């Protein structure tokens, strides 16, 4: 799919994603914080439609992500991210998508997620996260 | 003076400052790099005019600041930054202003200057720098 | 089990652990690098014996861990780390232990593992890793 790299910021304020209950995660967009000001990241859209949108509005800066988990699996011959769950110090958002396949999870004891990069074709092919103090 | 805090970024691309050969540093503005994209910082202007503008355009990312030095001294009863010099791995820019008073210098062996904060009234009252790998 | 926390160091030189193919990981000890010199970490031993010793000697500093993966699951009523695999830029060490249960994996695109903390009773209950540039 089309690769993207938002880079690193000061924090995360809002995550916007979409999913389909039968396939996987589609669109992905983040509103970051940049030295105290909101900074709207580029919307990384799927090549197709039919997804259900989800808005995760965090109470920045008191609320922040403590763990990201999900599932990767085959969809029409492609290994993609089928589900995502975001757990903050205040609540759990998700799971969104299909909870089937191989699970993965990244709990954070100290530090913050400050950016995302990955690739999206029909679905989210893969993604990585920038971490910092 | 009026305080300012640009915050931290990915790097530095250009520095725009002004000075007067008889007083001190006046205006100060930085064009940072934000994840590969130029980011124009707010122009921090002196309350007065009559300064000589200077533009330091760095050959980002191969060229970067390795040392910042200058002088602080009294001007009309105010302690301010009277001179600034920026040394990169390629050239030395400055000194700009008057090299009288108490010198200070910050050489960097490993790491980068990624942001500025301080205060400007008639002249640059004081400033600090954000450092990162 | 008994918690341990080695803290953060400069890098990793050697990892000494023990495991039982039919149960889980037992003993865990690391020889860290401390500013160019070896630093022998405390041997975190299982409360019981009967484990198979394994010595992972890395070609420090040219060789370093790029990914840690494994499985967690029950052994009697306890959830523990059943298996571990260490992948460096030169070789893959493991898997060691029961390769069944819930998988987990931590690929590192940029950065290094510089420390370990966790808990060990009869087996490795859980563990976390310190990361740095």
């Amino acid at each position: 799919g089309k690769a993207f790299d938002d880079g690193a910021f000061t924090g995360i304020r809002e995550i916007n994603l979409s999913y389909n209950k039968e396939t996987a995660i589609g669109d992905f967009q983040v509103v970051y914080d940049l030295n105290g000001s909101p900074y709207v990241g580029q919307n990384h859209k799927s090549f197709i439609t039919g997804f259900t949108p989800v808005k995760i509005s965090l109470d920045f800066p008191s609320e922040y992500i403590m763990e990201v988990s999900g599932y990767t699996g085959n969809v029409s011959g492609y290994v993609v991210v089928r589900s995502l769950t975001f757990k903050t110090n205040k609540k759990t958002y998700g799971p969104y998508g299909v909870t089937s396949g191989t699970p993965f999870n990244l709990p954070i004891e100290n530090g913050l997620i400050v950016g995302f990069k990955g690739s999206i074709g029909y679905w989210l092919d893969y993604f990585s996260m920038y971490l910092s103090l | 003076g009026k305080a300012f805090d640009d915050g931290a970024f990915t790097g530095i691309r250009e520095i725009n400052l002004s000075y007067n050969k008889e007083t001190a540093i006046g205006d100060f503005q930085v064009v940072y790099d934000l994840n590969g994209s130029p980011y124009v910082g707010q122009n921090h202007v002196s309350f007065i005019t009559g300064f000589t503008p200077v533009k330091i355009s760095l050959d980002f990312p191969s060229e970067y600041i390795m040392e910042v030095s200058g002088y602080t001294g009294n001007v009309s009863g105010y302690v301010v930054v009277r001179s600034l010099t920026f040394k990169t791995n390629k050239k030395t820019y400055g000194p700009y202003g008057v090299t009288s008073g108490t010198p200070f210098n910050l050489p960097i062996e490993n790491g980068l200057i990624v942001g500025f904060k301080g205060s400007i009234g008639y002249w640059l009252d004081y400033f600090s720098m954000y450092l990162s790998l | 089990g008994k918690a341990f926390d080695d803290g953060a160091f400069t890098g990793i030189r050697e990892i000494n652990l023990s495991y039982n193919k039919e149960t889980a990981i037992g003993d865990f000890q690391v020889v860290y690098d401390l500013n160019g010199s070896p630093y022998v970490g405390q041997n975190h031993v299982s409360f019981i014996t009967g484990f198979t010793p394994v010595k992972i000697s890395l070609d420090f500093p040219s060789e370093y861990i790029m990914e840690v993966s494994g499985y967690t699951g029950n052994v009697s009523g306890y959830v523990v780390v059943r298996s571990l695999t260490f992948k460096t830029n030169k070789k893959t060490y493991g898997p060691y232990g029961v390769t069944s249960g819930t998988p987990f994996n931590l690929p590192i695109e940029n950065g290094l593992i510089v420390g370990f903390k966790g808990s060990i009773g009869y087996w490795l209950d859980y563990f976390s890793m310190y990361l740095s540039l």
Binding site: A8, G70, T72, Y78, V79, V80, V81, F104, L106, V114, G115, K117, G118, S119, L124, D125, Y126, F127, S128, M129, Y130, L131, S132 | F9, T10, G11, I12, D33, L58, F60, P61, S62, E63, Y64, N110, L112, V114, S132, L133 | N105, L106, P107, I108, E109, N110, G111, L131, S132, L133
Partner: peptide, 16 residues
């Protein structure tokens, strides 16, 4: 060293 700041990056998870 370049003039670009670095940060720890973990992943990727998904397709190889």
């Amino acid at each position: 060293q370049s003039g670009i700041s670095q940060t720890v990056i973990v992943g990727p998870w998904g397709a190889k």
